[PDB]
């Protein structure tokens, strides 16, 4: 029985990055050999594990996030950063044991005009925990004065919208981000290599 | 212990084919990345390309129109294909052996000892 | 595009400790592993240390290596300095998985 990997990188559509997706592998045999987008990533590092390793080391459960932020943004997928992403949408534990990986996806999520499904949480009332999720759309209190369910001076809309259009900027540009989680907790290993 | 050979051709004139060899001794093609890497005299490493044991390629873009990599499980050999081929093109050519995850080589264990390829009119 | 380059050459005098600097150009070099490589004249290149730091099995304790992103680098450092350690060096790491190496470095015990 094979690791679905093939619908974590040949997934048509992606996860927004507050909204991010989270796919739970068990077992499986990971063939760990496939050329995922022609291995064109712009980032790929772990932390912890030792991808040369992975053929040979056996875990409990594999967590794979997923979602899409701009290019000078990947910075912040990575242990111990602060940031709009880091701080509001999807935060790495100081101890995060396995890989980050990132590939430009200009081709596939920009449009004439502009792409505007990818949301980002830009404001929030504290930073996110490790691995928190928050889907809230509550109008943010920037001000003395309340909110109620308002938008306007001093009342913001907590999600904002990634514009990406295919003549922008590299920084500017739609990223696919796969984050795997490499779990070994006191139970019956389930996911290894050949 | 595990051990890499490649051989061929040598002598080529301007637009020839470079093609070449590597054998395997010692192990199969299986969970290992299998690279062609050439250093011309005197200058610095160039990575030609990968293959995979299922005979997927990833070549480097400087070459791509011209190269091809392939795999031969039966001989436990793999190939090199240089098309309309240069002077630029000689060099010391090496077959690597490659260790990682998704296609990225993150350590490269055992090498050949590598054969030369002069192109000269 | 990312481009790694390395001095041309670097020396030092036996038993002490020489490092290989090697900076990135156009991008980061934190964002993939870096590996080094020992070429002795006439031979292959072989690994002495693979994803930033690891040292592959039977390479001395004495090769060790690290990233400064503050200055986007990594650096190559051979304690103990003996005479079979004299060669070019090569980094390696990625662009957009494709091999991106060094200009070489050239280390010469001085003898």
């Known amino acids: 029985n094979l690791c679905p990997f093939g619908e974590v990188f040949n997934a048509t559509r992606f996860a927004s990055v507050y909204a991010w997706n989270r796919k739970r592998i068990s077992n499986c045999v990971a063939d760990y050999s496939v050329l995922y987008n022609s291995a064109s990533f712009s980032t790929f590092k772990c932390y912890g594990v030792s991808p040369t390793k992975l053929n040979d080391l056996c875990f409990t459960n594999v967590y794979a996030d997923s979602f899409v932020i701009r290019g000078d943004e990947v910075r912040q997928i990575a242990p111990g950063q602060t940031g709009k992403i880091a701080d509001y949408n999807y935060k790495l534990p100081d101890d995060f044991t396995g890989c980050v990986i990132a590939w430009n996806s200009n081709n596939l999520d920009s449009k004439v005009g502009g792409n505007y499904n990818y949301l980002y949480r830009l404001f929030r009332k504290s930073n996110l925990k490790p691995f928190e999720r928050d889907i809230s759309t509550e109008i943010y209190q920037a001000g003395s004065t309340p909110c109620n369910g308002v938008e306007g001076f001093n009342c913001y809309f907590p999600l904002q919208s990634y514009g990406f259009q295919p003549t922008n900027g590299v920084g500017y540009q739609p990223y696919r981000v796969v984050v795997l989680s490499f779990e070994l907790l006191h139970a019956p290993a389930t996911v290894c290599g050949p | 212990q595990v051990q890499l050979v490649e051989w061929g051709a040598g002598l080529l004139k301007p637009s020839e084919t470079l093609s070449l060899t590597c054998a395997v001794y010692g192990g199969s093609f299986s969970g290992y990345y299998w690279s062609w890497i050439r250093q011309p005299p005197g200058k610095g490493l160039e990575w030609i390309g990968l293959?995979?044991?299922?005979?997927?390629?990833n070549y480097n873009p400087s070459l791509k129109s011209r190269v091809t990599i392939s795999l031969d499980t039966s001989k436990n050999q793999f190939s090199l294909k240089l098309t309309s081929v240069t002077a630029a093109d000689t060099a010391v050519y090496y077959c690597?052996?490659?260790?990682?995850?998704?296609?990225?080589?993150?350590?490269?264990?055992?090498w050949g000892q590598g054969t030369t390829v002069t192109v000269s009119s | 595009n990312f481009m790694l380059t390395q001095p041309h050459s670097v020396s030092e005098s036996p038993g002490k400790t020489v490092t290989i600097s090697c900076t990135g150009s156009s991008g980061s070099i934190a964002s993939n592993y870096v590996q080094w490589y020992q070429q002795r004249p006439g031979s292959a290149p072989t690994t002495v240390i693979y994803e930033d730091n690891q040292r592959p099995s039977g390479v001395p304790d004495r090769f060790s290596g690290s990233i400064d992103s503050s200055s986007n680098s990594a650096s190559l450092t051979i304690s103990g300095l003996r005479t079979e350690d004299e060669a070019d060096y090569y980094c390696q790491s990625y662009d957009s998985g494709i091999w991106v190496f060094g200009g070489g470095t050239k280390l010469t015990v001085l003898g």
């Open positions: 293959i995979n044991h299922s005979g997927s390629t």
């Open positions: 690597a052996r490659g260790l990682g995850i998704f296609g990225v080589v993150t350590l490269s264990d055992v």
